[PDB]
From Swiss-Prot:
Originating species: Homo sapiens
Name of the encoding gene: C3
Assembly, per entry: Interacts with CFH. Interacts with CR2.
Chain segments annotated as coiled-coil in the UniProt record: none
Full protein: residues contained: 1038 to 1086 of 1663
Record annotation: effect of changing R5M: Impaired binding of C3d to CR2
UniProt protein name: Complement C3d fragment
Length: 49
């Protein structure tokens, strides 16, 4: 379709920002800022990022 890529990039940037909201001070990630850090999720975030 083309031209629809720009709208896709905004979704990636938006998803990136949201994921940062769940980033704990330990630089790790989890389902919530309260739940214990998940080794897998933290590793997965790196894979996509």
């Amino acid at each position: 379709g083309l031209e629809k890529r720009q709208g896709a990039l905004e979704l990636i940037k938006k998803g990136y920002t949201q994921q940062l909201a769940f980033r704990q001070p330990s630089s790790a990630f989890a389902a919530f800022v309260k739940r214990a850090p998940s080794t897998w999720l933290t590793a997965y975030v790196v894979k996509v990022f």
